[PDB]
Amino acid sequence: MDIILGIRVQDSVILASSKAVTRGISVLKDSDDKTRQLSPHTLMSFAGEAGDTVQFAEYIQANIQLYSIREDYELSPQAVSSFVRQELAKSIRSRRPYQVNVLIGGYDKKKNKPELYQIDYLGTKVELPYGAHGYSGFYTFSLLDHHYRPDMTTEEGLDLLKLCVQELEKRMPMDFKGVIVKIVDKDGIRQVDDF
Amino acid sequence: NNYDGDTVTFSPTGRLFQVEYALEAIKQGSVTVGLRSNTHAVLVALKRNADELSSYQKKIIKCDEHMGLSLAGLAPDARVLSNYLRQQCNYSSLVFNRKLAVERAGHLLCDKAQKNTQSYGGRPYGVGLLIIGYDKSGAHLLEFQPSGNVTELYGTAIGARSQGAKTYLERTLDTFIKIDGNPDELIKAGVEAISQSLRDESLTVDNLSIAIVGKDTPFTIYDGEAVAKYI
Amino acid sequence: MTDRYSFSLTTFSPSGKLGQIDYALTAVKQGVTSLGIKATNGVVIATEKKSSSPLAMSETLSKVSLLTPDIGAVYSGMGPDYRVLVDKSRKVAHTSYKRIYGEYPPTKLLVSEVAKIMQEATQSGGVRPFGVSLLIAGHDEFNGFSLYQVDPSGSYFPWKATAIGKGSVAAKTFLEKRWNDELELEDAIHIALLTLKESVEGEFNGDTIELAIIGDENPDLLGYTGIPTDKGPRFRKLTSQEINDRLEAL
Amino acid sequence: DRGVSTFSPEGRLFQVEYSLEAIKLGSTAIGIATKEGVVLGVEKRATSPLLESDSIEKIVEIDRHIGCAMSGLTADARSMIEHARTAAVTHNLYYDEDINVESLTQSVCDLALRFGELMSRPFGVALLIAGHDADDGYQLFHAEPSGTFYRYNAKAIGSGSEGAQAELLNEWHSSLTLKEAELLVLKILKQVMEEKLDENNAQLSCITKQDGFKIYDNEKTAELIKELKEKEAAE
Amino acid sequence: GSRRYDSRTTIFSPEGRLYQVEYALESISHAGTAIGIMASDGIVLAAERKVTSTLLEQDTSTEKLYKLNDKIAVAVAGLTADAEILINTARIHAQNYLKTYNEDIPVEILVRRLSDIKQGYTQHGGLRPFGVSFIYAGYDDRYGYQLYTSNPSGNYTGWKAISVGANTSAAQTLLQMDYKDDMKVDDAIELALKTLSKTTDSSALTYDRLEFATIRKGANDGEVYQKIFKPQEIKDILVKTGIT
Amino acid sequence: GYDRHITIFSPEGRLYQVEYAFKATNQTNINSLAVRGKDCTVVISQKKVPDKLLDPTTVSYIFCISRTIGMVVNGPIPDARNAALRAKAEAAEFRYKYGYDMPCDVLAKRMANLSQIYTQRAYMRPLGVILTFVSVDEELGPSIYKTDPAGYYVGYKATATGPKQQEITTNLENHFKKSKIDHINEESWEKVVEFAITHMIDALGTEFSKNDLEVGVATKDKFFTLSAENIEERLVAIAEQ
Amino acid sequence: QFNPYGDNGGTILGIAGEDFAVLAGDTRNITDYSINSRYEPKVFDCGDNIVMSANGFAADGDALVKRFKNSVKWYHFDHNDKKLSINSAARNIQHLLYGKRFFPYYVHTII
Amino acid sequence: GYDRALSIFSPDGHIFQVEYALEAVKRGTCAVGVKGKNCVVLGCERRSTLKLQDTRITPSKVSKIDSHVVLSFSGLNADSRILIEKARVEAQSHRLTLEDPVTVEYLTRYVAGVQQRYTQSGGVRPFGVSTLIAGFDPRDDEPKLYQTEPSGIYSSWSAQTIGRNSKTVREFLEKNYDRKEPPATVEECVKLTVRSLLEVVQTGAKNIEITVVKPDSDIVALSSEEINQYVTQIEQEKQE
Amino acid sequence: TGYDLSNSVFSPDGRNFQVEYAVKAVENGTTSIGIKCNDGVVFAVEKLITSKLLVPQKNVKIQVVDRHIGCVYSGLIPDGRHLVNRGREEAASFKKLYKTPIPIPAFADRLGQYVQAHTLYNSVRPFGVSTIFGGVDKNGAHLYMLEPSGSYWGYKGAATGKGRQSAKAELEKLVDHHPEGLSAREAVKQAAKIIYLAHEDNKEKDFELEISWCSLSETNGLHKFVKGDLLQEAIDFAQKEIN
């Protein structure tokens, strides 16, 4: 799977993820949701090798849902991202490692802060104001480095994203069939159904 | 008494009670007879039913084209032991392209039963077996007991009231040993022998099980209408 | 074969006693008296070499044993149980400490390890507890000198001074009278020798008494020179002659 | 204590014999085999009227051509049913065909003597296994925790069994219709059951070659109970 | 074979109790009393050493109170050696959780896992259970200050104040009487000592027969400090509350 | 009382199975004795062949463990051979791993540790044997180290084992009280063997022919056993003195 | 480097009639340019009126045929001498072959 | 491994260790479940030998297995934790592989299967626990209530009770529960549940716990005062 | 007491009663013997004819190990077979590693240690046989006898079973009245005699005699059964000596 973006504004985290799924020569799908809700205030997007992406995402989702039931409590985004890092770092020295990169966007209800975590398949974790995986950052980071402010509204974040996606649509060779955008804030997770 | 709790204990007189108790399950089992000439070997077995609504328990099991047995006692144990034989016969064929000698089948059965009489947690087999077969040295009848003792005979019988058939065969010895080339006569003689062990009951069409193996005859079982000829 | 005793041989009786531990403590009570005293600049541990036959060469039997260069042990109870614990205690000082940290374990932690082994024999399948109580004396940089007792249950306690085995009750009372926090090591040796005479019937000399100290570093016992920071073992077994010199001064 | 695979001096396995006693305490199950099908019926025996009786599952499908009924420690039967279903489906996968009723029964019975110091004790439940196959037609088997199984024209198991078996000894003949067999199972259940037989506290089923194994609705069984009381009032 | 010598540690009595659990609890009832009291601004752990000798080294000693991590400690009543096995397990679980989630382990989660271990010894494996009851005193940011106990059955429950070991019946009555919900740490310290003073089987309560610990917000701002009392500090608090 | 049947403590802190194994030790009714010379270690044991059908040459309780170590056993032969085989395997493994010959005292300790385990672990019974190991150790000189079913071992100036061990022990004690030294001050092993046989005769009050004994000798770099006729040569020299 | 496979050549042919079936094969066995045998039979009677040929690498072909014949033998033991139908034989052989999916029998089988 | 067959048959055909596990349930605090027309209520006694308890943190008696199913129990508390953990793990595995949450019947059957397994496995004793399992299947509004016991038998119940004095409260429910017309409202159902416990409980104080499960993952614990209002209203009606 | 209910338990005397109980089963068995001769060994055994139905010559009791060792035993027959099977594995593994066939003294210890191993644990039962065995190796002839305890020695002659005392007595006579040696063919005859004489203690049923031998000169150091002409000759010799 190709492009996945994340940006953390004042009071929310926004994840944008490409909709295309390509099996070599043909585009099999143009409406694929490359995301899994881990808990009511934590969302994870993913990209990497076919099959492994979803297998990993769902495995993490099950573990966090299990934790939520056992303790009747929602893990903080930091805690979830550490669990996820450990699982990937575990996997990198396996017999057959997960080739999966992820962005974890959560709203920490205790600290009332949005948080964005970038973790690659090696289990390399980093907290960021904005992030991407693969080639996505190469096209978009110069725009985000310019326009990003820590005190942006959710709609200012979406406009900056709109610009990022336009640069990708201009200069990327691959047709990734647009992005699905999802917002993570104090009220949970919702989808922007028009982009 | 104090020494019969498991198979790993000897009595002060040197006996193995768990083995002897296993031998007792054979005696409550229904009667079966085996006997042979120089050309054929025959098994006859009286099948027992549970009541008039039930089938009559099958007592004879084929092991190979040239070998098979009849059982007296715990039936699932016969199934386990006969299955082991089917494999040993099979391994001898696949690997050596050789039909397993009846004598070897006996030695392998002895050695399998023996291990269950020397170890903790196991139990002896609760079944006796009469093994007939035709191999490179002719016809053979074997008697297996779960103590491990296997014995080659011209004829014998095991189960409830088997003593009657055993003496009949002890008398008939010089007669039935001569029945070469006549399958139907050897069976006739076997059916006569098992009849010394009947009381209150007699041989019916779904009561009687006969099996035969010999020079130019694959091991084959006769049940139902196919035994009326001999009633 | 196989060990098919995978269940505990030590269990709670209705009164809450752990029978096999109590019975093991009884085997320790029958054992020959041994003791330890902590001084300001050393520890001494001592016991009687109760020889079985006079044809036996009793210096070939070590009741006081070096565990590390700064840790020694003595016992009361069953000697064979002690011998294997010392083998295990020496190895565990290396495997779970020196091979990790590049230095010998401190007294309390090595004791902690020996105690663990003894606890496991009190709960594991198919084994009885060890029939010994140990006294372990040692030194380390951050805790100084210490003396520990380890019982069959696996419990251990730090002592200023104590005794175990046959004449322990009398010996502990003797030690209460003479121990203070200002004893120099020679004073503690002298007291150890006095305490030990009480519980010893026959001959009482350097050949029937086994006694070691945890004291000063012995660079003469190191075996090499040229590393300024390696200064040598603090554990030292006193010679037959050394003991007898202190028995006239008695 | 004494080994779990110990023989009694009479030559029987203590633990197998003791399991047979638990089966005697179980609710009644009856099977009758005809040339038109095999009927299977059971006494539900709800221990309290608040228990929703239709949640009592003592008759069970194994494959489309095999069903079975249980009596005894019914919790022990769950894994036997599981093995049975697996064996039936597996054989169809390996051979593109239906597995014989005897072969299925033999597979279940192989489980039964796998106990010792494998499971820790024998099963405390007996099964009536009924079905159809092309070679031997309609069949009923009684599979015990001894590892032995017997083919029966008719058979009862559980607390009311040797009373009911005596009755089956009299009433069974080789020309019974399915409908006659159904009424017979109902009749004999009504006789040996503690409380009064109705569509809620007893259950019927059959396996036919055409429609396979079916558990009967309560509406359907209620109608057969009505039909039965009328037949008996009529002489 | 070997079956002859098997005690069967994991069976029910005809009354439906676990023999070995009951007998272990019986063993624990002869152990030095340990008390935990929970306040709005902290927790106290007090425990009585078993009758000491004057030659026992007290300052370098630990028998009753153990640190599990920086925010959690336990008081022990039972076999010391048994308890250390479990303590090291608990210490390791705390670190696994911290390594995995990068957050300190919530008190209950640590308590549940230790209790679950004890439970296992009562259901499978044919081994004797651990002759240990714990009082857990800890702080986390979800439930604040927490007191728990676990016993050889593997059952655990939460408390405002609780005792384990000897004379718990007497001690529980005395705590029930004087404990109030708005209580402070310094009051709780006093109650803990006062209770041991009255329930002890010894002639009088001295510093050398005690271990003592507090968990306090008593640090600089939203954080928590564990204080294992040195012998001198116990002697001072004994005088200060007028028990000597 | 099941504390009698396996190796767990009795209420008085005893291990009855260990004690009863010590009793099996004397089941053969043989006595053995070991002494040290200047250059050698001698071990003698009574030899009893009751049955005329036995091949006397195959009846022995002395074992050649390695080139250098000899072992005499007091106890039933099956446990003796079990112990001998193990000691042989242990001595050879030691040589391979550490590059020098296993010392007598170390092998003794090793077998003692193995015995200890049987006193602690329930499924293993103790062996009904006492093992006397002899050699001329390259570091320690002539050596006697003896093992028992309790897992105890120690070095000896000299020792004896069997039903009448006490008579032999005191006889030897009395000699060493007189001579005031650790060993037999004798040059040749032939004379040390003669001393050993002589003092066994005095203590037991019995006379021996060449087939009533069994002799083992350890020298520097070999342990060997004497033939009937080597022993006969020895008996003759004793008589002429 | 050891090559566990070879090629023994051979050609086989099966035709389904209306109420009959034929399975033909040549009897020549080769490696490279050499003839090993001019008459080495390759089509076998397997019992229950089934004929089989496993063509290609003869060692693998022989192993498979042996195992199938053995499969028929045990089918009789386990299912009361029931006749193995041709469709049932075919499904069984699939499982024999696929059981070595990652180290295949290098043969083209026809029954 | 420790291998001993602890659950074995007796000459009379009983398995005593399973039966002695039932005796442990008998001694456990009472638990009751009543299913309404559009709800299930689960009530639980808490023994009043314990004040100075901290109820914030003390394990509550009704446990969520998933967000739509709950489980309560009478018997050994430590044993129940093991069954609860396994049930929760299975619930998430069912979602992961089937892409649908467990039906109440499936979850019950899993838990009962675990209990049965422990009655014929070497080296283990049976669970001294009986459970009430209640909730609503996904996209369904018919209420579910099931019971399991140490033997591993399970079944469905219009209303049911377990633990000490459960015979008394079963007697009550057997006379006070009309199948033809089940407690039509939440109020009606909670009332009947409370009433049945008051036949056995002692004080109406913090001795009673109530949990209400409505369809589609709506589950809520009642607090003291809300229960207390039910307690009050029942005594003022009966004085007549 | 209770000391005799579990194998490997020492009684307070110092005995293992279970091994002693195993000996009773040995004493209860048929008589079997071994005679050591000049360049070999001879083995013989009494086979009780339980019935006319026993096919004569066809229930062979003496067993070969490798190509040069013979084994015979009295007691529980299956236990004997189990022991011979282990003996055959021990001999195969010795040959495999060392090339030369296993020497007889070496072979005796292999069985010895294996039998002794079944007295170390309560989870196994001791062997219910005494086994007479031996043959010819590079150092000459060896005859051994091995008990349930694992105890074994080399013998000039040996016997075991119900008729063991009768045979023992007869063996002692040969040893005294042939102190310079006994030939292989002599030994075969004497073996027949001794089994016939020892058959008195088992007289209800009549019996079948079975002999084997390994001799450097007569069988090339290999184990062979005595059949037909040489067997009949020794049967005759024995039949003449009972009258």
mmCIF file of C-alpha atoms in Angstrom, chain E residues 55-207:
data_model
loop_
_atom_site.group_PDB
_atom_site.id
_atom_site.type_symbol
_atom_site.label_atom_id
_atom_site.label_comp_id
_atom_site.label_asym_id
_atom_site.label_seq_id
_atom_site.Cartn_x
_atom_site.Cartn_y
_atom_site.Cartn_z
ATOM 1 C CA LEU E 55 22.585 -10.589 68.473
ATOM 2 C CA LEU E 56 20.423 -10.290 65.337
ATOM 3 C CA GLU E 57 21.688 -7.568 63.003
ATOM 4 C CA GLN E 58 18.611 -5.338 62.687
ATOM 5 C CA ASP E 59 19.734 -2.382 60.532
ATOM 6 C CA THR E 60 20.929 -4.649 57.678
ATOM 7 C CA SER E 61 17.784 -6.813 57.970
ATOM 8 C CA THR E 62 14.617 -7.357 55.950
ATOM 9 C CA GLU E 63 11.969 -9.979 56.773
ATOM 10 C CA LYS E 64 8.600 -8.233 56.458
ATOM 11 C CA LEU E 65 8.718 -5.225 54.087
ATOM 12 C CA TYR E 66 9.844 -5.425 50.449
ATOM 13 C CA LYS E 67 10.030 -2.916 47.607
ATOM 14 C CA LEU E 68 8.295 -4.190 44.427
ATOM 15 C CA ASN E 69 8.966 -1.064 42.398
ATOM 16 C CA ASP E 70 9.230 2.670 43.220
ATOM 17 C CA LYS E 71 5.453 3.034 43.722
ATOM 18 C CA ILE E 72 4.534 -0.364 45.250
ATOM 19 C CA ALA E 73 5.641 -2.278 48.360
ATOM 20 C CA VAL E 74 4.440 -5.354 50.250
ATOM 21 C CA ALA E 75 4.265 -6.597 53.827
ATOM 22 C CA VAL E 76 4.860 -10.325 54.304
ATOM 23 C CA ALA E 77 3.249 -12.801 56.698
ATOM 24 C CA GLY E 78 4.328 -16.441 56.340
ATOM 25 C CA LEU E 79 7.388 -18.302 55.048
ATOM 26 C CA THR E 80 10.015 -15.677 54.141
ATOM 27 C CA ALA E 81 11.691 -17.916 51.541
ATOM 28 C CA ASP E 82 8.344 -18.631 49.828
ATOM 29 C CA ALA E 83 7.654 -14.887 49.728
ATOM 30 C CA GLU E 84 10.992 -14.006 48.070
ATOM 31 C CA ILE E 85 10.253 -16.369 45.159
ATOM 32 C CA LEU E 86 6.980 -14.499 44.583
ATOM 33 C CA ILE E 87 8.514 -11.058 45.199
ATOM 34 C CA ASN E 88 11.108 -11.542 42.436
ATOM 35 C CA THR E 89 8.358 -12.696 40.067
ATOM 36 C CA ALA E 90 6.372 -9.554 40.925
ATOM 37 C CA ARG E 91 9.427 -7.320 40.431
ATOM 38 C CA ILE E 92 9.950 -8.873 36.978
ATOM 39 C CA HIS E 93 6.286 -8.451 35.947
ATOM 40 C CA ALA E 94 6.480 -4.753 36.886
ATOM 41 C CA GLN E 95 9.463 -4.297 34.563
ATOM 42 C CA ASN E 96 7.885 -6.250 31.669
ATOM 43 C CA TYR E 97 4.867 -3.952 31.880
ATOM 44 C CA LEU E 98 7.085 -0.852 31.996
ATOM 45 C CA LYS E 99 9.154 -2.110 29.038
ATOM 46 C CA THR E 100 6.011 -2.936 27.024
ATOM 47 C CA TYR E 101 3.814 0.121 27.685
ATOM 48 C CA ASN E 102 6.403 2.668 28.936
ATOM 49 C CA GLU E 103 4.169 3.325 31.955
ATOM 50 C CA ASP E 104 4.409 2.095 35.546
ATOM 51 C CA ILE E 105 2.244 -0.949 36.244
ATOM 52 C CA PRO E 106 -1.156 -0.168 37.805
ATOM 53 C CA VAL E 107 -1.238 -1.632 41.322
ATOM 54 C CA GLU E 108 -4.157 -4.033 40.739
ATOM 55 C CA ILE E 109 -2.618 -5.562 37.605
ATOM 56 C CA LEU E 110 0.520 -6.510 39.562
ATOM 57 C CA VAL E 111 -1.621 -7.831 42.441
ATOM 58 C CA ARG E 112 -3.824 -9.894 40.099
ATOM 59 C CA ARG E 113 -0.880 -11.637 38.412
ATOM 60 C CA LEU E 114 0.708 -12.623 41.738
ATOM 61 C CA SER E 115 -2.667 -13.854 42.982
ATOM 62 C CA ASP E 116 -3.130 -15.782 39.715
ATOM 63 C CA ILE E 117 0.226 -17.520 40.270
ATOM 64 C CA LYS E 118 -0.794 -18.598 43.775
ATOM 65 C CA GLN E 119 -4.134 -19.825 42.380
ATOM 66 C CA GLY E 120 -2.363 -22.117 39.902
ATOM 67 C CA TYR E 121 -0.600 -23.961 42.730
ATOM 68 C CA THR E 122 -4.041 -24.848 44.160
ATOM 69 C CA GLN E 123 -5.454 -26.273 40.894
ATOM 70 C CA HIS E 124 -2.635 -28.068 39.028
ATOM 71 C CA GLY E 125 0.906 -29.456 39.271
ATOM 72 C CA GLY E 126 0.604 -31.360 42.571
ATOM 73 C CA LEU E 127 2.898 -28.972 44.461
ATOM 74 C CA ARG E 128 2.342 -27.414 47.885
ATOM 75 C CA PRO E 129 1.029 -23.833 47.790
ATOM 76 C CA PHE E 130 3.046 -20.815 48.933
ATOM 77 C CA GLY E 131 2.715 -20.230 52.685
ATOM 78 C CA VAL E 132 2.410 -16.472 52.251
ATOM 79 C CA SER E 133 -0.121 -13.678 52.635
ATOM 80 C CA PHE E 134 0.776 -10.237 51.270
ATOM 81 C CA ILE E 135 -0.376 -6.733 52.070
ATOM 82 C CA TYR E 136 0.182 -4.616 48.942
ATOM 83 C CA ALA E 137 0.622 -0.875 49.465
ATOM 84 C CA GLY E 138 0.885 1.113 46.238
ATOM 85 C CA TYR E 139 0.093 4.230 44.221
ATOM 86 C CA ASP E 140 -0.908 4.718 40.589
ATOM 87 C CA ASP E 141 -2.560 7.576 38.673
ATOM 88 C CA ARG E 142 -5.927 5.820 38.093
ATOM 89 C CA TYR E 143 -7.026 4.823 41.606
ATOM 90 C CA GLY E 144 -4.472 6.741 43.692
ATOM 91 C CA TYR E 145 -3.492 5.071 46.963
ATOM 92 C CA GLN E 146 -4.458 1.396 47.212
ATOM 93 C CA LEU E 147 -4.274 -1.395 49.786
ATOM 94 C CA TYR E 148 -4.724 -5.052 48.864
ATOM 95 C CA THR E 149 -4.187 -8.457 50.425
ATOM 96 C CA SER E 150 -3.615 -11.819 48.772
ATOM 97 C CA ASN E 151 -3.394 -15.223 50.481
ATOM 98 C CA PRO E 152 -2.390 -18.803 49.465
ATOM 99 C CA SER E 153 -5.807 -19.402 47.830
ATOM 100 C CA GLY E 154 -4.931 -16.687 45.296
ATOM 101 C CA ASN E 155 -7.916 -14.579 46.325
ATOM 102 C CA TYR E 156 -7.251 -10.846 46.687
ATOM 103 C CA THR E 157 -9.357 -7.983 48.078
ATOM 104 C CA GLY E 158 -8.956 -4.228 48.657
ATOM 105 C CA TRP E 159 -8.895 -2.382 51.980
ATOM 106 C CA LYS E 160 -8.908 0.946 53.816
ATOM 107 C CA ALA E 161 -7.106 -0.833 56.641
ATOM 108 C CA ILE E 162 -6.175 -4.497 57.077
ATOM 109 C CA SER E 163 -3.967 -6.867 59.062
ATOM 110 C CA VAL E 164 -2.461 -10.288 58.311
ATOM 111 C CA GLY E 165 -0.640 -12.873 60.423
ATOM 112 C CA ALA E 166 -1.206 -13.331 64.157
ATOM 113 C CA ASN E 167 -4.131 -11.818 66.070
ATOM 114 C CA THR E 168 -5.907 -10.369 63.020
ATOM 115 C CA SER E 169 -9.313 -10.818 64.695
ATOM 116 C CA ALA E 170 -8.198 -8.603 67.589
ATOM 117 C CA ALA E 171 -6.368 -6.165 65.300
ATOM 118 C CA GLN E 172 -9.207 -5.873 62.758
ATOM 119 C CA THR E 173 -11.614 -4.946 65.575
ATOM 120 C CA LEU E 174 -9.244 -2.227 66.850
ATOM 121 C CA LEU E 175 -8.802 -0.784 63.337
ATOM 122 C CA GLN E 176 -12.555 -0.876 62.648
ATOM 123 C CA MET E 177 -13.057 1.185 65.813
ATOM 124 C CA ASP E 178 -10.593 4.070 65.342
ATOM 125 C CA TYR E 179 -10.308 4.274 61.529
ATOM 126 C CA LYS E 180 -12.070 7.219 59.857
ATOM 127 C CA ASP E 181 -12.130 7.995 56.105
ATOM 128 C CA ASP E 182 -10.755 11.576 56.187
ATOM 129 C CA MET E 183 -7.730 10.296 58.178
ATOM 130 C CA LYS E 184 -4.194 11.534 57.443
ATOM 131 C CA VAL E 185 -0.904 9.624 57.204
ATOM 132 C CA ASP E 186 0.456 10.854 60.549
ATOM 133 C CA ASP E 187 -2.754 9.713 62.260
ATOM 134 C CA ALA E 188 -2.555 6.393 60.374
ATOM 135 C CA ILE E 189 1.047 5.825 61.512
ATOM 136 C CA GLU E 190 -0.126 6.234 65.103
ATOM 137 C CA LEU E 191 -3.126 3.893 64.670
ATOM 138 C CA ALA E 192 -0.899 1.207 63.120
ATOM 139 C CA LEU E 193 1.522 1.293 66.068
ATOM 140 C CA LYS E 194 -1.219 1.628 68.700
ATOM 141 C CA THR E 195 -2.871 -1.497 67.250
ATOM 142 C CA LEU E 196 0.330 -3.594 67.267
ATOM 143 C CA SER E 197 0.990 -2.316 70.801
ATOM 144 C CA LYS E 198 -2.261 -3.883 72.020
ATOM 145 C CA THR E 199 -2.205 -7.082 69.915
ATOM 146 C CA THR E 200 1.473 -8.096 70.308
ATOM 147 C CA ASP E 201 2.298 -11.331 72.166
ATOM 148 C CA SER E 202 5.542 -9.718 73.396
ATOM 149 C CA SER E 203 5.905 -7.920 76.744
ATOM 150 C CA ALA E 204 6.309 -4.499 75.109
ATOM 151 C CA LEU E 205 6.800 -3.011 71.642
ATOM 152 C CA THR E 206 10.367 -1.813 70.978
ATOM 153 C CA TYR E 207 12.041 -0.426 67.844
#
